[PDB]
Ligand binder design. Structure first.
Ligand SMILES: [Zn+2]
Lengths: 99, 78, 60, 204, 128, 154
RNA sequence: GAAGAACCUUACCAGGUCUUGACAUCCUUUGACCACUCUAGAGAUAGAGCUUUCCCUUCGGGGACAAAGUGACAGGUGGUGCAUGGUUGUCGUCAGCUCGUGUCGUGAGAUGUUGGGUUAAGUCCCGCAACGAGCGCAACCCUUAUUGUUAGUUGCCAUCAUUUAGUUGGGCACUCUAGCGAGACUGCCGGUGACAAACCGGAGGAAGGUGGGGAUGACGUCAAAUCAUCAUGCCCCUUAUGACCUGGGCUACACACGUGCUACAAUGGGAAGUACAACGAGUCGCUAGACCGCGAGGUCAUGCAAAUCUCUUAAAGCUUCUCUCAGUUCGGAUUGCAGGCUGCAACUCGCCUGCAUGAAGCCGGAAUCGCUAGUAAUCGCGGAUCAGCACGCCGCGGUGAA
């Protein structure tokens, strides 16, 4: 209800533990929480010719991934609201409180 | 391909209208590479720069359509 | 001549169709990833040094 | 050429990046501020002999950390040097910087430090052979599993370039669970520029 | 009521078969089996499970599908049938295996590789 | 190839006449990953065949085949390092292979502007021993045993 | 190299221009530069106009800042891969290359690393004056194929109802998403084998024998390549090979070669109906919808910073009709005219549309290349660089042989 939070990082351990922390901060005070919903994990791609003057054969391709989570909550009491306002850690994964 | 009117640079128009009263001075040096031809140009004599030298050429009637750059070719083959 | 050229871009251009891309630390004119502002080789190397968040090697 | 930068492979898999943040749509300022700060502490390395640099990302501030074999020399006499750091940095950043320090232990078994030292000795016109040998002396005896050392260029300030080095212990390379480090430095007295590259191995 | 299910996968296409007692029939995406299918008489292919067990009728088939071409997903319904018939009697699976048509064909399009025009094509190459 | 022989990828029977040969012939008309068209010209040719002199699209087919499938073949071998071509005892399968090959290819040049009249007429003429495919098999057997003298004890 | 040459970018040529100079540091006076407009100009600039204005004050001062000067000087895509660092190409994904201690030989050297068995392999077993080891092989890694569990939206619709519809009620069953687990190890059967290693067949199983694919490149050879990504010894330019601007090059054409695309048609040309993927991109950008013009497009308006909205109903495919073997209704190079888009500006030197004209070309010598399976062949989709411009390159998927 009227609140949810997205996640976007790279290593899954930090995302999953952030998920556990927020689920604690939600189901602690009140209830009606939603689990750590998986998401399609966008991916990028590049291609660098692995040389410096010639030989456009030797390619060297790299990548990027972005795991995601998503959690909504229902009946947020003033307690867990302000606990959300104060919870900031960890600091490797970007979250965003959203209605 | 410029159906919002043709185009000729102002540092040529003012320098071509300035003769509309009297006779025309035989010389109008320019860059001569961005301008189409307007009806107000017939009878003049404009020299045309080709990146190396300016090329003096008069103005006839049917020679009014295209741009200025089609008379001093910068190729010089032979 | 790379110094006069590098100094050229830091100014506002003469017209809009003139502001191109060129690496920051090095100065390659060609093939600069306009997501990172690195040239082709500089990103290649810096990926090895573990200093671009994200980028790894891609096996699949 | 054929070989692969070995901390370019264990990266992400078993060892992680050393710039821990996340930046969508703001991904050139952050990069070219990280680069700026990473460059500008090369003054310390002249004597501080640092090893690593982290770039954490606050909400609106800069938290980093470093490690060096001499904690007193970096922070200064009464911690005032770290203050000069803070004030030069935020001025360089336009963002409040919050530095931190941890002391490095067993600074023999590093890699960048060892390369720093052997390039130092090579600057003073000393015999490369005994330099490599005593380097691996003090390294292996500090407790390790293998070291290789390479040197190349106009060796002994002499004619056509060469390359040769010596190794003790044993270092598997194609295996992945390796945690092997790597460092590459440069020096010269008057003949262009020399080349030294060092590899260690301290557990899978 | 009584309903029987079973899935099938081929060339990255997947069909969700549904079985029920009827006269021998299949309604692919609320359409007659001869609509989704082109001209294709690869229908013996599709009834081929029946030609070995419950020979050769008669149940009905609800079926969803998505992905791949026609031939791919067409072959991909063949296996929901196998799994459904398998649900009925675990006394049939031997005669299915001996006649096969039970394991998922893992052949699929190849990961290409940089430097080659195709998955394996090598460019023509001047000798001298 | 170098180690040892290898498997052979048998085909399925046909969905009309249920013939391994029919499928094995449909495959040898397809060009560039486009199949249905081949099946269509096959079926239309079959109907045309059965129309005039209706016996079967299958029986006259096998007639034309046994008219074609050879029994020997010159196999160039340099046992003496030279241009020795020795008549070989052709295998069973390759016989059918060559049957279909000569049939389809040499029929492709029959020359009816119509799409599949070319095939139908060809196999109907072959079943009655008129046409170069029959002449092709007879030419193979006339070049075999044309030199079996010096090329048999090998 | 070049993963975007109209100007640039851009080194090169013709012109018009500057000197501690476009860029960095010091020092002397200082002290805060801007920006703005009008003129003459092809601009570079020149010339005038309100002006660049103290951001700390203890009464003493400091930074950004000009401008001038001053000399310290900067500057160079100038030179040498044959003085160099670093980074690649190949032999080669070929199976090899070595060492310590013992022992042999007057010595260069040899033994190990050889013979028999075995193998993808210096992989293993057996015997042997050799005993042991290291970089290599393999394994540890990523992905594909089966699935248990944990979780159910922006995903799914089986059990219910209703609406244009999974939409909206209702549900999380399935599908899918994605974490943790499970699973292939010659593990059991028979046989062959000196009982060893291994090999042939079998069950079970989703896959059986390195399941399929990738990343991963030993000692070294080739004075291979690169001072033009960067760096650097030495040699060199210095009122000029350093620097600013406009215009042209790099797109020149009697000719020889390498790589590609479209074709020489009846499995085809045209016209009309009819369905099915996958990978990814999106805020000054993807356009919904509707209106207009036959078209490239324009107009007003709509969501979308995301499993929601858009690019985007994929094309070959499947069903009918017409065309009859001809340079043809095939082929559409080339060219006239009229338009569209971005762009300060498309002659030199963009992409695209309509009309009109309609070239060579009817399967190609000697010779020569690629390819062992979801491969070859064939058909579409996307995106990197990027106002704009792809038959190239990097990925995806459909059909599917000998
Ligand atoms: Zn760069």
């Amino acid at each position: 209800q009227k609140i949810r939070i997205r996640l976007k990082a790279y290593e899954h351990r930090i995302l999953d533990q952030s998920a556990d922390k927020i689920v604690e901060t939600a189901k602690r005070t009140g209830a009606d929480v939603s689990g750590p919903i998986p998401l399609p994990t966008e991916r990028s791609l590049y291609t660098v010719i692995r040389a410096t003057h010639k030989y456009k054969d030797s390619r060297e391709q790299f990548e990027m991934r972005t795991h995601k989570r998503l959690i909504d909550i229902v009946n947020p009491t003033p307690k867990t609201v302000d606990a959300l306002m104060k919870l900031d850690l960890p600091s490797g994964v970007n979250i965003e409180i959203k209605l | 391909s410029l159906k919002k009117g043709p185009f000729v640079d102002d540092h040529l128009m003012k320098k071509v209208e300035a003769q509309q009263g009297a006779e025309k001075k035989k010389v109008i040096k320019t860059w001569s590479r961005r301008s189409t031809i307007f009806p107000s140009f017939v009878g003049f004599t404009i020299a045309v720069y080709d990146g190396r030298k300016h090329v003096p050429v008069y103005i006839q009637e049917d020679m009014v359509g295209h741009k200025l750059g089609e008379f001093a070719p910068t190729r010089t083959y032979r | 001549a790379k110094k006069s050229m590098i100094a050229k871009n830091k100014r506002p251009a003469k017209h809009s169709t003139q502001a191109y891309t060129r690496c920051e630390r090095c100065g390659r004119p060609h093939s600069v990833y306009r997501k990172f502002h690195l040239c082709r080789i500089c990103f290649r190397e810096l990926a090895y040094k573990g200093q671009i968040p994200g980028v790894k090697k891609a096996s699949w | 050429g054929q070989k692969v930068h070995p901390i370019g492979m264990r990266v992400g898999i078993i060892r992680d990046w050393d710039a821990k943040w996340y930046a969508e749509k703001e991904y050139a300022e952050f990069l070219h501020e990280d680069l700026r700060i990473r460059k500008f502490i090369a003054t310390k390395l002249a004597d501080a002999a640092v090893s690593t640099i982290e770039i954490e990302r606050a909400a609106n501030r800069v938290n980093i950390s470093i490690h060096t074999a001499k904690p007193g020399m970096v922070i200064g006499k009464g911690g005032s040097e770290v203050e000069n750091l803070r004030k030069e940095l935020n001025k360089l950043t336009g963002k409040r910087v919050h530095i931190n320090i941890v002391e490095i232990k067993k600074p023999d078994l590093d890699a960048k430090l060892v390369g720093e030292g052997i390039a130092r000795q090579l600057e003073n016109r000393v015999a490369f052979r005994r330099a490599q040998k005593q380097a691996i002396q003090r390294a292996m005896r500090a407790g390790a599993k293998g070291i290789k050392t390479q040197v190349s260029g106009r060796l002994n300030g002499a004619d056509i370039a060469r390359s040769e080095g010596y190794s003790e212990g044993t270092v598997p390379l194609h295996t992945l669970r390796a945690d092997i480090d790597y460092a590459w430095e440069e020096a010269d007295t008057t003949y262009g520029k020399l080349g030294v590259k060092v590899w260690i191995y301290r557990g899978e | 009521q009584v309903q029987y299910s079973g899935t099938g996968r081929r060339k990255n296409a997947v069909a969700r078969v549904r079985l029920v007692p009827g006269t021998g029939k299949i309604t692919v995406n609320k359409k007659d089996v001869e609509e989704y299918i082109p001209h294709a008489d690869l229908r013996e292919v599709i009834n081929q499970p029946f030609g070995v067990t419950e020979t050769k009728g008669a149940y009905d088939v609800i079926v969803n599908v998505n992905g791949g071409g026609y031939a791919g997903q067409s072959g991909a319904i063949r296996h929901g049938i196998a799994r459904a018939l398998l649900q009925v009697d675990p006394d049939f699976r031997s005669a299915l295996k001996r006649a096969g048509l039970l394991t998922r064909d893992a052949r699929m399009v190849e990961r290409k590789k940089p430097g080659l025009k195709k998955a394996r094509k090598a460019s023509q190459f001047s000798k001298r | 190839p170098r180690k040892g022989p290898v498997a052979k990828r048998d085909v399925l029977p046909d969905p009309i006449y249920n013939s391994k040969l029919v499928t094995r012939l449909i495959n040898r008309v397809m060009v560039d990953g486009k199949r249905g068209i081949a099946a269509n010209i096959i079926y239309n040719s079959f109907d045309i065949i059965k129309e005039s002199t209706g016996n079967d699209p299958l029986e006259v087919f096998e007639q034309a085949m046994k008219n074609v499938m050879p029994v020997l073949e010159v196999k160039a071998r340099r046992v003496g390092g030279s241009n020795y071509q020795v008549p070989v005892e052709v295998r069973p399968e390759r016989r059918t292979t060559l049957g279909l090959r000569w049939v389809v290819n040499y029929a492709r040049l029959r020359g009816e502007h119509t799409m599949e009249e070319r095939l139908a007429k060809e196999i109907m003429d072959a079943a009655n021993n008129t046409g170069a495919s029959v002449k092709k098999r007879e030419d193979t057997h006339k070049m075999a045993d044309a030199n079996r003298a010096f090329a048999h004890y090998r």
